[PDB]
């Protein structure tokens, strides 16, 4: 939905605003469908478990499935009488709190997808952003047609930077020297004891992937995180260039209109910022920040 | 609401729900749900990538087992034969026209070819009948005076 | 001829690398840079292909007492064996391939 | 003269492969077009067309009998229309737009 | 040498590692 | 960081005490040395 | 053709052109081959070329020389002398796996069907059996039936068949800590008429790799020669013959990859004092023509040993969690419930014969119950489901080639073969297969 | 280590400076030196008889 | 569709052939063994819902014995895993002397080979599948045989298409021909009355009415001519009025 098709819509148009790369939609929409099917996958089992709601003091039960399915209603006899309206109300209400209870549910698994496919376009951001050629300016800067001028509001910001100076520190480095720290620990005296140990055969199995026997469903063996270093890898544009100009000039053009938008994007969520925290005002009276250009 | 119930099976009316026991419980055990946020159905490590295990969405169009074993093996052979020529240990940018660009002397490999997969057969074909390896040879040759 | 410029395809050799060559078309390849030139692109494989289609495209044909591999007697009698040799699966891999 | 292709984005040599192929071949009857329609920013009957023509690819890849079932299955709709507009208009063949 | 007369006299050898060390000590710093 | 933090996750989560989660050790200014600082001439003045 | 008498047909050369083409479409597929090792020698024995009838000029044996191109294709071209000891006896060991399948489904079965009408009898007679019986929890009690590492082999299960144990019921799961090795794969042991330092495995991979044997195995061994070297007829000792009872403990690492053998320890501790240490062989085939008789000298060899002259040898301490199953012959059979790979709740180990009631008394230091129910194994955790010993056989059969490098026989190429992604040929994620 | 955890880092650093600036000198020492003798090279004499016939000095310097 | 032992418990949802009244089952028993389902009598006016086509309830209604029971059918049996409904004409025992009630709520209720020829689970029966044990004796069936023992008994030698002589079956289809993916949609004219009567093809040049028109359109070519040379496939442009000719196609 609309949350990964704006966070891959502004991701889109990074990795060509920020490197001349251009994604293959092919790949943007892998992405969403990647999205969609966390999505059919939760639903899925989020249909084999029940919330049970209950009208006052819990006269009406009502059981549903989080989707919001009604299933059953046990109902106390005191409330056949009650009048046709008033028993619709009820149960309706018994309903809608039952419908909460599954709709918070969903709403905290609908973070566990936020999250995995977090951890889905990490490699990517960390792609395009955990390089030597990765930088920006002060949004401020009156970018000129030769650089960036400079800021006069604020004055010295906090220029940070993601990456160390020294030689490259890359997460798969990072990662094989987590199994050796792994493996030396196995080896130590708390480590091959703890491993002897229930904390030690939990974590075997809820993390070890080179044990997955011959059929076993998920990682069957040890993945080093991703990489995919934009300012060193012309991603689609050598493609579309070699075949045709056209999808060529309409490929990036669509990337570039994409980065545009979500600039309007923080353009307008700052602009209700400042409405809101007394910076701007309603109606425009700063012209000269449109009018001397 | 009103379909719903209908299809729901009606309202099932049973005596005394969420009323309380003089001792303060109620009869008639509530219904009690079995709901809570799936802890294994992230979606990445189902439909993985085909022949490594990297469990994401991200199409990489691989390289073949073989061609990219000989490949980057004598990319090393190219890089230690260039940059580092004379053998000192020392990486000299500066080889000579035969050093940069002589090819390396690796076509070792055919001839490990020609002594395990061609001889072999080399040593086999002295049980084919002579008309058949005439042939094609000839054939293979390109000189066949088939009268027409 | 066939046998020859077909399916023996080791008695093909290609254009052998120099190694700066091998050197720098693996550094340009492993990492796209900023501005490549055109000429560290041309792939080994679509190099053999484009061999052996220069190769069906210079066949010719006449007597074979010169210095032709076959005449179009010697060449449809191969397609008319090979044509009755084909079965179903046979058929749809070569009607597949009219098609394309 | 054959060297452009309209709509240079989703190309055939990238469809060779089925998507998501053994999550599909394992329960299809948990995986209609509709999990897969988000695949392809398409149209959707172009999508559903190139779904069957994956099913089909990923059948005969296991070497197994296809379901010529599929393209009916997917465009039940469709299918159904094509029905009814023959008992209709009491032709045979597919219906076409000018006819509706 | 002391702790800043290493970093004065590394900062004409290794930019690399003093660049690092500095970012590093920024930001330990306004923790 | 995310990285480590997995790690991290991992050891504080079911007992592998190597590496991140077991402690570094520093140095500390030594008894006798009235030194406030890090010296690299001086070992005897950081002491473990 | 150039012959009046032959056919122009040479199978020897047919073949030969098969394997080329199988080359060179490998060299199409990957780019590269494997080149085939100097231990690559092409047998072209069972190929034969053609026979051609006189008086009708027609072929004689034509599904002979196809059947013989066939036979000399699945043969690939090495010895031995190629592969490991390791990998030969692991294939030695497939090979007979697959030859004994039919009869082991068969002798399954058919033990399964024994204890099941044991079932049916306990259940039948008496009167007042039947009577107690009637009630389905009472029933479901009585037996239930539980795969095996074998086959799906009943269980018996009561209050009264549990409680010898100690156990509470089978649907009680417990942790445990427990006796093993620091290194099983490390067993040591000085035989003292020996003084040879043996380093032994017991675990149950190559415990089997040497013909099945696993680590406690109770066997009984028989001679063919005489203990008192006399050929002579008139007093001899060992034609009358002497019955070995044994022991397995694993595989001593000696310095050959191929020559060490199985250890067993007699169980006669007399003869352990005296006699020493027996090494079984340095195969399943090596074993078997040592011996005349092996044999599992128990009814089901489930009867898990102790290992006493190891007892001190073992000083870990295993936390294992399990689940009560079943007590086959008074021997009780556990569903572990951590396992290495299975991070859910699916991936319960199979039934597992733990040793008998004394075992549980002595190496069962903790056995703490709970309440639980019966979840059988998974597919990929269910062994005789899962049981690759054929395509395991195919594997190593073609393992050396692997070993070789990768050279392309269309020689200059340097350009990686760009293979694709999702391809159905590339595709090696086996989720569920 | 959590409360002055930079101690560690700090220490880190002092361990690198060590085994690291004598490589580090040495490798400025020696590239200050070939620098400082191209400078002289240039200035020597072969620039003057360069200068009187070229052509004879690329022949030389190509030969030898 | 599971098995908990081998023995395979389908999940499927009987109806009336035209869906009304339908009754479902968790896990029912498949021995392919019964040629016949064996439902309890209860649900004949479960599922009896009396359409049009089937005045009464079901069509065919016979007192059979296995009388024990009403033989009735034909009843759409759906089952889970398969998208194929399987009809059936069950045998419609009494819960009397055939107590099917054996738990506590379960029914003992068995899937019969009379479906199981109609669903995908019939994959399961020739030998390798799921239920080729339980399959009845007969001298087609070696019962605990390999598998692999049948397969070689039948002729397997390789893998699939291991020897190269055998295509691969992957490159089956190296190209799937989807029209607007690849150069666009025919242009697709007719010559007769119709689209499916008439045929794609024009008249080639020639045609007696067309000859002239082709001289002229060769010695005049840069001209107009009249005539019926147009209405030909031979036309003046390099683009000949040849069938399946692709009318957007980006380069032509």
Same mark, same amino acid.
């Given at each position: 939905?609309?949350?990964?098709?704006?966070?891959?819509?502004?991701?889109?148009?990074?990795?060509?605003?920020?490197?001349?790369?251009?994604?293959? #939609?092919?790949?943007?929409?892998?992405?969403?469908?990647?999205?969609?099917?966390?999505?059919?996958?939760?639903?899925?089992?989020?249909?084999?478990?029940?919330?049970?709601?209950?009208?006052?003091?819990?006269?009406?039960?009502?059981?549903?499935?989080?989707?919001?399915?009604?299933?059953?209603?046990?109902?106390?006899?005191?409330?056949?009488? +009650?009048?046709?309206?008033? /028993?619709?109300?009820?149960?309706?209400?018994?309903?809608?709190?039952?419908?909460?209870?599954?709709?918070?549910?969903?709403?905290?698994? $609908?973070?566990?997808?936020?999250?995995?496919?977090?951890?889905?376009?990490?490699?990517?951001?960390?792609?395009?952003?955990?390089?030597?050629?990765?930088?920006?300016?002060?949004?401020?800067?009156?970018?000129?047609?030769?650089?960036?001028?400079?800021?006069?509001?604020?004055?010295?910001?906090?220029?940070?930077?993601?990456?160390?100076?020294?030689?490259?520190?890359?997460?798969?480095?990072?990662?094989? @020297?987590? /199994?050796?720290?792994?493996?030396?620990?196995?080896?130590?005296?708390?480590?091959?004891?703890?491993?002897?140990?229930?904390?030690?055969?939990?974590?075997?199995?809820?993390?070890?992937?080179?044990?997955?026997?011959?059929?076993?469903?998920?990682?069957?063996?040890?993945?080093?995180?991703?990489?995919?270093?934009?300012?060193?890898?012309?991603?689609?544009?050598? !493609?579309?260039?070699?075949?045709?100009?056209?999808?060529?000039?309409?490929?990036?053009?669509?990337?570039?209109?994409?980065?545009? !938008?979500?600039?309007?994007?923080?353009?307008?969520?700052?602009?209700?910022?400042?409405?809101?925290?007394?910076?701007?005002?309603?109606?425009?009276?700063?012209?000269?920040?449109?009018?001397?250009? | 609401?009103?379909?719903?119930?209908?299809?729901?099976?009606?309202?099932?009316?049973?005596?005394?729900?969420?009323?309380?026991?003089?001792?303060?419980?109620?009869?008639?055990?509530?219904?009690?749900?079995?709901?809570?946020?799936?802890?294994?159905?992230?979606?990445?490590?189902?439909?993985?990538?085909?022949?490594?295990?990297?469990?994401?969405?991200?199409?990489?169009?691989?390289?073949?087992?073989?061609?990219?074993?000989?490949?980057?093996?004598?990319?090393?052979?190219?890089?230690?034969?260039?940059?580092?020529?004379?053998?000192?240990?020392?990486?000299?940018?500066?080889?000579?026209?035969?050093?940069?660009?002589?090819?390396?002397?690796?076509?070792?490999?055919?001839?490990?070819?020609?002594?395990?997969?061609?001889?072999?057969?080399?040593?086999?074909?002295?049980?084919?009948?002579?008309?058949?390896?005439?042939?094609?040879?000839?054939?293979?040759?390109?000189?066949?005076?088939?009268?027409? | 001829?066939?046998?020859?410029?077909?399916?023996?395809?080791?008695?093909?050799?290609?254009?052998?690398?120099?190694?700066?060559?091998?050197?720098?078309?693996?550094?340009?390849?492993?990492?796209?840079?900023?501005?490549?030139?055109? =000429?560290?692109?041309?792939?080994?494989?679509?190099?053999?292909?484009?061999?052996?289609?220069?190769?069906?495209?210079?066949?010719?044909?006449?007597?074979?007492?010169?210095?032709?591999?076959?005449?179009?007697?010697?060449?449809?009698?191969?397609?008319?064996?090979?044509?009755?040799?084909?079965? #179903?699966?046979?058929?749809?891999?070569?009607?597949?391939?009219?098609?394309? | 003269?054959?060297?452009?292709?309209?709509?240079?984005?989703?190309?055939?040599?990238?469809?060779?492969?089925?998507?998501?192929?053994?999550?599909?071949?394992?329960?299809?009857?948990?995986?209609?077009?509709?999990?897969?329609?988000?695949?392809?920013?398409?149209?959707?009957?172009?999508?559903?067309?190139?779904?069957?023509?994956?099913?089909?690819?990923?059948?005969?890849?296991?070497?197994?009998?296809?379901?010529?079932? +599929?393209?009916?299955?997917?465009?039940?709709?469709?299918?159904?229309?094509?029905?009814?507009?023959?008992?209709?208009?009491?032709?045979?063949?597919?219906?076409?737009?000018?006819?509706? | 040498?002391?702790?800043?007369?290493?970093?004065?006299?590394?900062?004409?050898?290794?930019?690399?590692?003093?660049?690092?060390?500095?970012?590093?000590?920024?930001?330990?710093?306004?923790? | 960081?995310?990285?480590?933090?997995?790690?991290?996750?991992?050891?504080?989560?079911?007992?592998?005490?190597?590496?991140?989660?077991?402690?570094?050790?520093?140095?500390?200014?030594?008894?006798?040395?009235?030194?406030?600082?890090?010296?690299?001439?001086?070992?005897?003045?950081?002491?473990? | 053709?150039?012959?009046?008498?032959?056919?122009?047909?040479?199978?020897?050369?047919?073949?030969?052109?098969?394997?080329?083409?199988?080359?060179?479409?490998?060299?199409?597929?990957?780019?590269?081959?494997?080149?085939?090792?100097?231990?690559?020698?092409?047998?072209?024995?069972?190929?034969?070329?053609?026979?051609?009838?006189?008086?009708?000029?027609?072929?004689?044996?034509?599904?002979?020389?196809?059947?013989?191109?066939?036979?000399?294709?699945?043969?690939? =071209?090495?010895?031995?002398?190629?592969?490991?000891? &390791?990998?030969?006896?692991?294939?030695?060991?497939?090979? &007979?796996?697959?030859?004994?399948?039919?009869?082991?489904?068969?002798?399954?079965?058919?033990?399964?069907?024994?204890?099941?009408?044991?079932?049916?009898?306990?259940?039948?007679?008496?009167?007042?059996?039947?009577?107690?019986?009637?009630?389905?929890? &009472?029933?479901?009690?009585?037996?239930?039936?539980?795969?095996?590492?074998?086959?799906?082999?009943?269980?018996?299960?009561?209050?009264?068949?549990?409680?010898?144990?100690?156990?509470?019921?089978?649907? @009680?799961?417990?942790?445990?800590?427990?006796?093993?090795?620091?290194?099983?794969?490390?067993?040591?042991?000085?035989?003292?008429?020996?003084?040879?330092?043996?380093?032994?495995?017991?675990?149950?991979?190559?415990? *089997?790799?040497?013909?099945?044997?696993? *680590? =406690?195995?109770?066997?009984?061994?028989?001679?063919?020669?005489?203990?008192?070297?006399?050929?002579?007829?008139?007093?001899?000792?060992?034609?009358?013959?002497?019955?070995?009872?044994?022991?397995?403990?694993?595989?001593?690492?000696?310095?050959?990859?191929?020559?060490?053998?199985?250890?067993?320890?007699?169980?006669?501790?007399? +003869?352990?004092?005296?006699?020493?240490?027996?090494? +079984?062989?340095?195969?399943?085939?090596?074993?078997?023509?040592?011996?005349?008789?092996?044999?599992?000298?128990?009814?089901?060899?489930?009867?898990?040993?102790?290992?006493?002259?190891?007892?001190?040898?073992?000083? @870990?301490?295993?936390?294992?969690?399990?689940?009560?199953?079943?007590?086959?012959?008074?021997?009780?059979?556990?569903?572990?419930?951590?396992?290495?790979?299975?991070?859910?709740?699916?991936?319960?180990?199979?039934?597992?014969?733990?040793?008998?009631?004394?075992?549980?008394?002595?190496?069962?230091?903790?056995?703490?119950?709970?309440?639980?129910?019966?979840?059988?194994?998974?597919?990929?955790?269910?062994?005789?489901?899962?049981?690759?010993?054929?395509?395991?056989?195919?594997?190593?059969?073609?393992?050396?080639?692997?070993?070789?490098?990768?050279? &392309?026989?269309?020689?200059?190429?340097?350009?990686?073969?760009?293979?694709?992604?999702?391809?159905?040929?590339?595709?090696?994620?086996?989720?569920?297969? | 280590?959590?409360?002055?955890?930079?101690?560690?880092?700090?220490?880190?650093?002092?361990?690198?400076?060590?085994?690291?600036?004598?490589?580090?000198?040495?490798?400025?020492?020696?590239?200050?030196?070939?620098? @400082?003798?191209?400078?002289?090279?240039?200035?020597?004499?072969?620039?003057?008889?360069?200068? !009187?016939?070229? $052509?004879?000095?690329?022949?030389?310097?190509?030969?030898? | 569709?599971?098995?908990?032992?081998?023995?395979?418990?389908?999940?499927?949802?009987?109806?009336?052939?035209?869906?009304?009244?339908?009754?479902?089952?968790?896990?029912?028993?498949?021995?392919?063994?019964?040629?016949?389902?064996?439902?309890?009598?209860?649900?004949?006016?479960?599922?009896?819902?009396?359409?049009? !086509?089937?005045?009464?309830?079901?069509?065919?209604?016979?007192?059979?014995?296995?009388?024990?029971?009403?033989?009735?059918?034909?009843?759409?049996?759906?089952?889970?895993?398969?998208?194929?409904?399987?009809?059936?004409?069950?045998?419609?025992?009494?819960?009397?002397?055939?107590?099917?009630?054996?738990?506590?709520?379960?029914?003992?209720?068995?899937?019969?080979?009379?479906?199981?020829?109609?669903?995908?689970?019939?994959?399961?029966?020739?030998?390798?599948?799921?239920?080729?044990?339980?399959?009845?004796?007969?001298?087609?069936?070696?019962?605990?045989?390999?598998?692999?023992?049948?397969?070689?008994?039948?002729?397997?030698?390789?893998?699939?298409?291991?020897?190269?002589?055998?295509?691969?079956?992957?490159?089956?289809?190296?190209?799937?021909?989807?029209?607007?993916?690849?150069?666009?949609?025919?242009?697709?004219?007719?010559?007769?009355?119709?689209?499916?009567?008439?045929?794609?093809?024009?008249?080639?040049?020639?045609?007696?009415?067309?000859?002239?028109?082709?001289?002229?359109?060769?010695?005049?070519?840069?001209?107009?001519?009249?005539?019926?040379?147009?209405?030909?496939?031979?036309?003046?442009?390099?683009? /000949?009025?040849?069938?399946?000719?692709?009318?957007?196609?980006?380069?032509?």
């Amino acid at each position: 939905m609309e949350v990964y098709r704006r966070i891959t819509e502004r991701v889109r148009g990074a990795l060509w605003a920020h490197h001349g790369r251009l994604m293959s #939609e092919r790949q943007f929409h892998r992405i969403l469908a990647y999205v969609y099917n966390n999505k059919y996958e939760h639903q899925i089992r989020f249909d084999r478990m029940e919330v049970v709601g209950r009208a006052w003091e819990g006269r009406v039960e009502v059981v549903t499935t989080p989707a919001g399915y009604l299933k059953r209603v046990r109902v106390n006899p005191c409330l056949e009488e +009650l009048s046709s309206y008033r /028993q619709q109300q009820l149960i309706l209400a018994a309903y809608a709190d039952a419908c909460a209870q599954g709709r918070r549910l969903m709403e905290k698994a $609908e973070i566990n997808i936020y999250k995995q496919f977090l951890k889905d376009l990490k490699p990517i951001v960390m792609g395009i952003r955990d390089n030597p050629e990765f930088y920006t300016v002060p949004e401020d800067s009156v970018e000129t047609v030769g650089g960036t001028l400079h800021m006069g509001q604020g004055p010295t910001p906090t220029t940070y930077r993601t990456i160390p100076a020294a030689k490259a520190h890359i997460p798969v480095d990072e990662i094989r @020297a987590r /199994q050796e720290w792994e493996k030396k620990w196995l080896n130590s005296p708390q480590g091959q004891s703890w491993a002897l140990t229930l904390r030690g055969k939990r974590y075997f199995a809820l993390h070890g992937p080179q044990y997955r026997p011959r059929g076993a469903p998920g990682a069957k063996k040890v993945t080093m995180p991703l990489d995919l270093p934009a300012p060193y890898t012309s991603m689609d544009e050598r !493609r579309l260039l070699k075949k045709n100009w056209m999808a060529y000039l309409d490929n990036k053009h669509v990337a570039e209109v994409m980065w545009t !938008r979500a600039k309007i994007a923080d353009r307008e969520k700052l602009q209700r910022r400042l409405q809101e925290t007394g910076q701007a005002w309603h109606r425009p009276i700063n012209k000269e920040a449109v009018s001397r250009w | 609401i009103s379909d719903m119930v209908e299809d729901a099976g009606g309202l099932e009316v049973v005596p005394g729900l969420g009323e309380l026991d003089a001792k303060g419980t109620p009869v008639v055990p509530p219904l009690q749900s079995n709901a809570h946020v799936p802890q294994n159905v992230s979606f990445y490590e189902m439909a993985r990538h085909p022949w490594e295990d990297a469990a994401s969405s991200w199409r990489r169009d691989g390289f073949t087992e073989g061609s990219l074993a000989n490949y980057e093996a004598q990319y090393r052979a190219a890089e230690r034969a260039v940059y580092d020529e004379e053998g000192r240990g020392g990486h000299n940018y500066w080889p000579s026209r035969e050093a940069s660009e002589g090819v390396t002397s690796e076509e070792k490999d055919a001839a490990l070819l020609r002594e395990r997969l061609f001889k072999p057969l080399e040593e086999a074909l002295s049980g084919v009948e002579p008309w058949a390896r005439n042939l094609r040879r000839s054939a293979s040759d390109g000189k066949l005076g088939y009268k027409t | 001829w066939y046998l020859q410029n077909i399916l023996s395809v080791e008695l093909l050799k290609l254009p052998s690398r120099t190694n700066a060559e091998k050197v720098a078309i693996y550094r340009n390849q492993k990492h796209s840079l900023s501005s490549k030139k055109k =000429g560290e692109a041309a792939q080994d494989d679509e190099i053999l292909a484009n061999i052996i289609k220069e190769r069906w495209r210079t066949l010719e044909f006449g007597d074979r007492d010169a210095g032709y591999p076959c005449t179009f007697s010697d060449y449809i009698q191969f397609l008319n064996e090979w044509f009755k040799s084909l079965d #179903e699966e046979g058929m749809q891999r070569l009607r597949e391939h009219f098609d394309r | 003269r054959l060297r452009y292709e309209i709509n240079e984005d989703y190309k055939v040599r990238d469809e060779l492969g089925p998507e998501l192929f053994a999550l599909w071949s394992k329960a299809p009857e948990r995986w209609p077009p509709e999990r897969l329609s988000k695949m392809y920013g398409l149209d959707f009957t172009l999508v559903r067309k190139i779904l069957v023509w994956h099913h089909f690819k990923a059948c005969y890849d296991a070497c197994v009998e296809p379901d010529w079932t +599929l393209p009916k299955r997917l465009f039940a709709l469709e299918w159904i229309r094509d029905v009814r507009a023959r008992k209709h208009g009491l032709f045979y063949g597919k219906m076409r737009f000018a006819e509706q | 040498k002391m702790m800043v007369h290493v970093i004065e006299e590394l900062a004409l050898r290794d930019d690399g590692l003093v660049m690092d060390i500095q970012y590093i000590v920024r930001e330990n710093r306004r923790n | 960081k995310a990285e480590h933090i997995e790690t991290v996750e991992r050891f504080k989560q079911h007992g592998i005490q190597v590496g991140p989660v077991r402690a570094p050790a520093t140095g500390f200014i030594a008894a006798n040395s009235k030194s406030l600082s890090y010296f690299t001439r001086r070992p005897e003045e950081v002491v473990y | 053709t150039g012959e009046v008498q032959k056919v122009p047909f040479s199978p020897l050369q047919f073949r030969i052109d098969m394997e080329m083409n199988k080359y060179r479409r490998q060299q199409k597929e990957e780019g590269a081959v494997r080149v085939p090792p100097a231990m690559w020698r092409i047998d072209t024995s069972a190929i034969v070329p053609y026979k051609v009838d006189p008086k009708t000029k027609r072929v004689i044996n034509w599904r002979e020389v196809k059947e013989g191109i066939e036979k000399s294709f699945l043969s690939t =071209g090495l010895p031995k002398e190629a592969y490991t000891g &390791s990998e030969w006896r692991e294939m030695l060991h497939l090979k &007979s796996i697959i030859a004994g399948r039919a009869a082991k489904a068969a002798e399954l079965e058919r033990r399964l069907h024994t204890d099941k009408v044991k079932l049916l009898e306990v259940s039948s007679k008496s009167k007042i059996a039947s009577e107690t019986n009637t009630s389905t929890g &009472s029933s479901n009690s009585s037996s239930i039936i539980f795969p095996d590492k074998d086959g799906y082999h009943v269980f018996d299960t009561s209050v009264a068949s549990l409680r010898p144990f100690g156990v509470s019921q089978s649907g @009680a799961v417990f942790q445990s800590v427990t006796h093993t090795y620091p290194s099983p794969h490390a067993v040591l042991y000085n035989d003292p008429v020996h003084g040879k330092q043996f380093i032994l495995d017991t675990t149950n991979e190559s415990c *089997h790799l040497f013909g099945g044997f696993e *680590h =406690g195995d109770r066997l009984l061994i028989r001679a063919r020669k005489i203990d008192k070297n006399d050929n002579n007829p008139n007093s001899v000792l060992a034609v009358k013959g002497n019955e070995f009872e044994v022991i397995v403990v694993g595989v001593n690492k000696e310095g050959s990859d191929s020559e060490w053998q199985l250890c067993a320890m007699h169980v006669d501790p007399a +003869l352990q004092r005296e006699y020493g240490l027996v090494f +079984l062989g340095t195969d399943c085939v090596d074993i078997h023509e040592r011996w005349a008789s092996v044999r599992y000298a128990a009814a089901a060899p489930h009867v898990k040993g102790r290992v006493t002259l190891l007892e001190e040898r073992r000083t @870990a301490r295993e936390e294992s969690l399990g689940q009560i199953v079943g007590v086959r012959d008074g021997v009780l059979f556990v569903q572990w419930r951590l396992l290495r790979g299975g991070g859910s709740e699916m991936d319960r180990s199979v039934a597992e014969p733990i040793g008998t009631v004394e075992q549980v008394r002595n190496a069962y230091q903790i056995t703490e119950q709970g309440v639980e129910e019966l979840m059988h194994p998974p597919s990929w955790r269910t062994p005789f489901r899962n049981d690759f010993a054929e395509e395991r056989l195919e594997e190593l059969r073609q393992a050396p080639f692997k070993r070789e490098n990768w050279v &392309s026989l269309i020689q200059g190429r340097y350009t990686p073969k760009l293979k694709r992604f999702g391809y159905t040929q590339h595709t090696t994620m086996d989720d569920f297969e | 280590y959590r409360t002055m955890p930079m101690l560690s880092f700090y220490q880190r650093i002092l361990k690198h400076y060590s085994d690291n600036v004598q490589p580090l000198r040495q490798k400025a020492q020696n590239s200050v030196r070939g620098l @400082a003798r191209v400078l002289e090279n240039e200035r020597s004499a072969a620039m003057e008889e360069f200068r !009187r016939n070229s $052509e004879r000095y690329w022949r030389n310097v190509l030969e030898g | 569709f599971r098995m908990k032992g081998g023995e395979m418990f389908v999940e499927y949802k009987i109806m009336s052939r035209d869906h009304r009244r339908s009754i479902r089952v968790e896990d029912a028993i498949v021995d392919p063994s019964v040629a016949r389902t064996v439902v309890p009598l209860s649900w004949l006016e479960q599922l009896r819902s009396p359409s049009l !086509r089937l005045h009464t309830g079901y069509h065919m209604e016979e007192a059979v014995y296995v009388p024990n029971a009403i033989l009735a059918g034909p009843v759409v049996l759906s089952i889970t895993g398969q998208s194929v409904p399987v009809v059936l004409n069950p045998y419609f025992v009494p819960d009397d002397t055939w107590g099917i009630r054996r738990n506590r709520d379960e029914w003992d209720l068995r899937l019969g080979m009379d479906a199981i020829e109609q669903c995908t689970l019939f994959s399961e029966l020739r030998p390798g599948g799921l239920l080729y044990n339980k399959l009845p004796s007969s001298q087609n069936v070696t019962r605990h045989e390999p598998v692999r023992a049948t397969l070689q008994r039948y002729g397997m030698k390789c893998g699939l298409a291991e020897s190269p002589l055998v295509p691969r079956p992957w490159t089956r289809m190296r190209y799937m021909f989807i029209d607007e993916l690849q150069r666009g949609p025919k242009l697709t004219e007719f010559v007769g009355h119709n689209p499916r009567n008439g045929t794609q093809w024009r008249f080639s040049q020639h045609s007696k009415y067309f000859r002239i028109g082709v001289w002229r359109e060769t010695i005049r070519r840069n001209d107009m001519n009249e005539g019926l040379h147009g209405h030909s496939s031979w036309q003046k442009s390099p683009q /000949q009025a040849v069938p399946e000719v692709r009318l957007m196609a980006p380069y032509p």
